[PDB]
Design a protein around this ligand. Structure first.
Ligand SMILES: Nc1ncnc2c1ncn2[C@@H]1O[C@H](COP(=O)(O)OP(=O)(O)O)[C@@H](O)[C@H]1O
Ligand SMILES: [Mg+2]
Length: 267
């Protein structure tokens, strides 16, 4: 819990609220990341919210959720560093982009790993209920074929106008579009992600929000590519049902004959 306990190796990327940097823990040489948060402009009330939210982050321990390790205050630069597990495989948005550029669809086995492991991450989120975001850019891969749901973003729970505005809400469920808790809405979002992993495009595309909402409400989309099994297409399609009560529960997903031990985590 001191900055001097770690050495920054390099900046992985700049997020909406600060840099994510690869770091090395001096005690044992463990490779981790930290995320920078500038709290200099925050009120006491906002900082109190931040404290409560960091503590909730610390409570989520699951093989399929990016692990929280530490928090560091650099009072001199009013910077809070949140230390977390490093995921060497990077994010799924990059995986999708790679598939598109290299003109190569992803293995069904990979899609099954994501479905299995993210469903389990969601199961844990539901048990604890908690902001979560299933977009590909927030799902990560380690070096052992494990899939981890990334942190929501402390500042994000708290720039937030910029991308809440500009961005297109590809994964928003029909019911959340009418009015924002519903665990079946997470299943819809999972369906969108899995669909995009298969098709390399989301199930509903549009250039405007109005157009997108129209498509979402109609609930129609192309079949995922034919290289993917009818069984996989079936389950993704069920997750994209207009009726929340027709979408499979976490339990129903995991009972699917597609899902086997090897699709789960192995550390
Ligand atoms: N645990 C992690 N392991 C490896 N890379 C990460 C991790 N978390 C975020 N990244 C990467 O760091 C960069 C910044 O992302 P992030 O810090 O999550 O901010 P934002 O949510 O605003 O995009 C992105 O390239 C992202 O893929
Ligand atoms: Mg993030």
């Amino acid at each position: 819990s001191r900055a001097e306990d770690y050495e920054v190796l390099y900046t992985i990327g700049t997020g909406s609220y600060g840099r994510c940097q690869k770091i090395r823990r001096k005690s044992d040489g463990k490779i981790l990341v930290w995320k920078e948060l500038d709290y200099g402009s925050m009120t006491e009330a906002e900082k109190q919210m931040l404290v409560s939210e960091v503590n909730l982050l610390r409570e989520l321990k699951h093989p399929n959720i990016v692990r929280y390790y530490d928090r560091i205050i650099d009072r001199t630069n009013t910077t809070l560093y949140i230390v977390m597990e490093y995921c060497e495989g990077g994010d799924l948005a990059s995986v999708i982009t790679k598939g598109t550029k290299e003109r190569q669809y992803l293995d069904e086995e990979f899609v099954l790993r994501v479905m299995t492991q993210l469903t389990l991450a969601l199961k844990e989120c539901h048990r604890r209920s908690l902001h979560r975001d299933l977009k590909p850019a927030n799902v990560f891969l380690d070096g052992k074929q494990n899939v981890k749901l990334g942190d929501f973003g402390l500042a994000r729970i708290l720039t937030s106008f910029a991308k809440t505005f500009v961005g297109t809400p590809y994964y928003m469920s029909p019911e959340q579009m009418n009015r924002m808790y519903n665990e079946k809405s997470d299943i819809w979002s999972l369906g969108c992600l899995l669909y995009e992993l298969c098709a390399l495009m989301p199930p509903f595309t549009a250039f405007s929000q109005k157009e997108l909402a129209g498509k979402i409400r109609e609930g129609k989309f192309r079949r995922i590519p034919y290289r993917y099994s009818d069984e996989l297409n079936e389950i993704i399609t069920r997750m994209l049902n207009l009726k929340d009560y027709h979408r499979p529960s976490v339990e129903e997903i995991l009972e699917n004959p597609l899902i086997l031990e090897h699709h789960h985590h192995h550390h």
